[PDB]
């Protein structure tokens, strides 16, 4: 008689039956003549795996206390996806907390602009280039060329 079953199946009455696909919950056991019966998850609810659950799960709320907001509302196969506010980024890919974007200080400039999921990279302004302000947007400006200066100040011709 059967011991294990394959993926997306479960053993019941000495026989393999189908698990319910993502998006649906178990409602009635299979028989020897009929396969497992399932029902799509209702509004606000979801199930993201092949499963034998009789109830779906509630969509997570995006915690405002961590500067978090709904980005994509949850489907029946997918949880709520959160993100941060304008001007903040998620600490991780998984977006568990929100942090203000780094400003590149005087003598530095943005090598990379801040995204919504990662942070500003800064570079020290090399020879030939300068910056005099802290900004999460602004890059290193080049020196006025002398066909009519520091990592901070513009040269005077």
């Amino acid at each position, epitope marked *: 008689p059967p011991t294990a079953c*394959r993926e997306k199946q479960y053993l019941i009455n000495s026989q*393999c*039956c189908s698990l319910c696909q993502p998006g649906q919950k178990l409602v009635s056991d*299979c*028989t020897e*003549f*009929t*396969e497992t*019966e399932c029902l799509p998850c209702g509004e606000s609810e979801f199930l993201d795996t092949w499963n034998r659950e009789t109830h779906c799960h509630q969509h997570k709320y995006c915690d405002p206390n961590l500067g978090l907001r709904v980005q994509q509302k949850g489907t029946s196969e997918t949880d709520t996806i959160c993100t941060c506010e304008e001007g903040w980024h998620c600490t991780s890919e998984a977006c568990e907390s929100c942090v203000l974007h780094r400003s590149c200080s005087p003598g530095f400039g943005v090598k990379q602009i801040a995204t919504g999921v990662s942070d500003t990279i800064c570079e020290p302004c090399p020879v030939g280039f300068f910056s005099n302000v802290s900004s999460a947007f602004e890059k290193c400006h080049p020196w006025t060329s002398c066909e009519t200066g520091t990592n901070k100040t513009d040269v005077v011709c």
Partner: antibody
Amino acid sequence: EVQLVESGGGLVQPGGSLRLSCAASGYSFTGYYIHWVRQAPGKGLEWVARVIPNAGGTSYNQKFKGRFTLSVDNSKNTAYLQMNSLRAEDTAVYYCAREGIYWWGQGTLVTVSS
Amino acid sequence: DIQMTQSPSSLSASVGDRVTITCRSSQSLVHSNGNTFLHWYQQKPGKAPKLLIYTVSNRFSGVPSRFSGSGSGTDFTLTISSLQPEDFATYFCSQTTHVPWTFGQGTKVEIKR
């Protein structure tokens, strides 16, 4: 062998009720689902519902979840389809089938008209 | 709901000729226990459907040998090897792997003479 006799059909008016019966023999009644299927004149079969008499489940087509009710009397190895708020497009031959059994009986014609 | 897509809709063929009908399932009709619950019926006007083939290919007791079912998964064929006059009917397939049970749109076969 396993035998299922449909019974109860006839002429009823729009908004009327009607309970059909499926009297079953030749198998262990409580261990298998009885399904109801119907066939409107000129059209294909349409699955209605099923019930298993271990009192351990009933399944209804979305279309009929309000109005129809399956039901069972173990003492008489019989299953019942109760149809309510009948409409003219419920006019059909109502058949009756045990899971595992792929042949059809004669059914019982239900007509719904003024 | 599993959609069964049956074709052709109508055909006409001479006595003795091979007749082929297709059913397709929108997804696999194979149960996890291995059985594939697809079935073929013949239905004559005013009569109940007569079982021809059960579980894809098993010809039902009493059914003539000219009726035979083949296929697997989502792809099935009913063959009448040698059409006969008495074979005028609407033929149609059935899936019972899942509830709701669903059915092909049928094929009306007619003898040409």
